[PDB]
């Protein structure tokens, strides 16, 4: 993990995320959407659990992206919760929650749920 | 449970659901939306687990409602997963998933997640 997590990750749609996993459990980086234009880039911050077990378990982690940058304000945020699996074909499998700010009458439609798998390729 | 589940349940918004929990784990009934007009009523079908434990555990259950009736076709379905707790103040606590049929490009926004608590009052 840590060293293994640092790098570029891609999901089944093309989104790319670049992270630096620091010594003490911090995750910092950027997420970029499809197209890959200068700034479809947003800041991501998360944490990972830095002393994972030794039975081949995955490394639990999660991160958040607020969909606001200098070109777009989507008034929403996504959190990804999952684990990193290293090896020949390392991957991070996640489940995510995307919440949009709504009025109290529309709060029922405020959170979408999905899953993403990221690979180094 | 079973006898305890059968009856009318209301959630924090006013929705009402009426179920009959049958001897062999079946749940059948109707769900009605706010307003409570003749047919804001949809059919619900589910299952509950009929021989629950004796340490005060809740009774696991779930049901589905397809949002189509003779007045409306919302092209969606909701599933509620949770447990029934009996007693002075019995309640069913659930987490739900509402999926809308989308095209493959919009599948990412197809499922909303939320929670509901139902009481007899």
């Amino acid at each position: 993990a840590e060293a293994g997590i640092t790098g570029t990750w891609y999901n089944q749609l093309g989104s790319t995320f670049i992270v630096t996993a620091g010594a003490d459990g911090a995750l910092t980086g950027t997420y970029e959407s499809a197209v890959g234009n200068a700034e479809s880039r947003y800041v991501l911050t998360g944490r990972y659990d830095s002393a994972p077990a030794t039975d081949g378990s995955g490394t639990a982690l999660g991160w958040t992206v607020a969909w606001k940058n200098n070109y777009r304000n989507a008034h929403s945020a996504t959190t990804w919760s999952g684990q990193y699996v290293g090896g020949a074909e390392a991957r991070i499998n996640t489940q995510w929650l995307l919440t949009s700010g709504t009025t109290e009458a529309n709060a029922w439609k405020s959170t979408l749920v999905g899953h993403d798998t990221f690979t180094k390729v | 449970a079973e006898a305890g589940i059968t009856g009318t349940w209301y959630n924090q918004l006013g929705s009402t659901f009426i179920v009959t929990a049958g001897a062999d784990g079946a749940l059948t009934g109707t769900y009605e939306s706010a307003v409570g007009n003749a047919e804001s009523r949809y059919v619900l079908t589910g299952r509950y687990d009929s021989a629950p434990a004796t340490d005060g555990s809740g009774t696991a259950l779930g049901w589905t409602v397809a949002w189509k009736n003779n007045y409306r076709n919302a092209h969606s379905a909701t599933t509620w997963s949770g447990q029934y707790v009996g007693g002075a103040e019995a309640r069913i606590n659930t987490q739900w998933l509402l999926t809308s049929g989308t095209t493959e490009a919009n599948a990412w926004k197809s499922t909303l997640v939320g929670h509901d608590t139902f009481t007899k009052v």
């Binding site: 749609l13 989104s15 959407s33 499809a34 197209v35 479809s40 947003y42 992206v65 969909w67 777009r72 989507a74 929403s76 996504t78 995307l98 | 990412w108 926004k109």
Partner: peptide, 6 residues
């Protein structure tokens, strides 16, 4: 479409 995607 949403930035998470496009």
């Amino acid at each position: 479409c949403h930035p998470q995607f496009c």
